[PDB]
């Protein structure tokens, strides 16, 4: 397989719950192991803007998502926001790529300043210190200078700042096709196969 075997997927409280669910689905279909993390604000967002009835506590959540995605047993592990015994909490853990999608402006700030106030924030802190991949998917508009300075600092340290800014150049016919654009971008960044977004110009030889 190309790309990482294990991905820490954190969802935080920005608009765009559909991006996180769709990415979790694609990762499951590519037979990757997923350590799933979700913030209390992200649970509110998912309730407000989708019809997914996600259980509150980690054990019921893991059952639910395993079903929702057609996953194998043990494929999705769910960890709570203060579970410091979970792999993402420590750099001595086995190597994982991490994606925060969506990434709230609050979580962006926490990762930029090193706040480490919960498992999501600490797991990003660990990714940076161990130089493991870290992809942040913000959804906000306008971006203030506070937002931008946080993104610049993280990008300069090697995090990939991938905003939820879909392109329109693959004939999108629905909301799902825009969601897939961004998910494909994330998958390309991780080095994981995807077939939702073609390789640009791959058949063009000259002109």
Ligand X SMILES: Cc1cc2c3c(c1C)C(C)(C)CC=[N+]3c1c([nH]c(=O)[nH]c1=O)N2C[C@H](O)[C@H](O)[C@H](O)COP(=O)(O)O
167 to 206, contacts with ligand X by CB under 6 A? 167, 169
Kindly tell me which of 3 and 163 has the beta carbon lying closer to ligand X. Answer: 163
Q: Which two tokens stand for residue 133?
A: 């991949």
Element (H, E) at 136: strand 134-138
- The partner residues of 98 in beta bridges, in order of sequence, read 8, 134
Task: Give least dist CB 41 to ligand X, A.
Answer: 3
Q: Which of 197, 170, 160, 38 is nearest to 104 (CA)?
A: 38
Angle between helices 175-190 and 17-29 (to 10 degrees): 60
Give, as ranges, the residues between 95 and 124 that touch ligand X (CB under 6 A). Answer: 104-107, 116-117, 122
According to CB under 8 A, which residues from 158 to 177 bind a copy of itself?
158, 160-165, 167-169, 171-175, 177
Contacting residue, 54, 69, 110, 183, with a copy of itself by CB under 8 A: 110
- What value does the CA radius of gyration of the chain take, rounded to a whole number of Å? 17
In this structure, are residues 134 and 140 in contact, taking their beta carbons and an 8 Å threshold? no
Give the x-and-dash track for 46-85 against a copy of itself (CB under 8 A). --xx--------xx--x-----------x--xxxx--xxx
Binding site for ligand X (CB under 6 A): 12-15, 39, 41-42, 44-45, 48-49, 84, 90, 104-107, 116-117, 122, 139-140, 167, 169
């Amino acid at each position: 397989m190309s790309g990482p075997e294990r991905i820490t997927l954190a969802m935080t409280g920005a608009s765009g719950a559909q991006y996180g669910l769709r990415l979790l689905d694609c990762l499951v279909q590519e037979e990757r192991e997923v350590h799933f993390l979700i913030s209390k604000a992200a649970q509110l967002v998912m309730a407000t803007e989708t019809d997914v009835a996600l259980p509150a506590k980690p054990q019921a959540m893991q059952a639910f998502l395993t079903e929702y995605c057609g996953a194998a047993a043990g494929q999705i592990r769910v960890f709570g926001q203060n579970d410091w015994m979970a792999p993402p909490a420590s750099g001595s853990s086995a190597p994982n790529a991490m994606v925060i999608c969506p990434c709230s402006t609050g979580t962006l700030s926490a990762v930029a300043t090193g706040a480490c106030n919960n498992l999501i924030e600490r797991a990003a802190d660990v990714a940076l210190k161990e130089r493991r991949p870290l992809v942040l998917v913000p959804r906000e508009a306008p971006f203030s200078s506070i937002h931008l300075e946080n993104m610049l600092k993280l990008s300069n340290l090697g995090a990939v700042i991938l905003p939820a800014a879909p392109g329109f150049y693959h004939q999108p016919q629905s909301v799902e096709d825009l969601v897939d654009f961004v998910v494909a971008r994330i998958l390309n960044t991780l080095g994981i196969p995807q077939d939702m977004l073609p390789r640009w110009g791959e058949q063009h030889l000259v002109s």
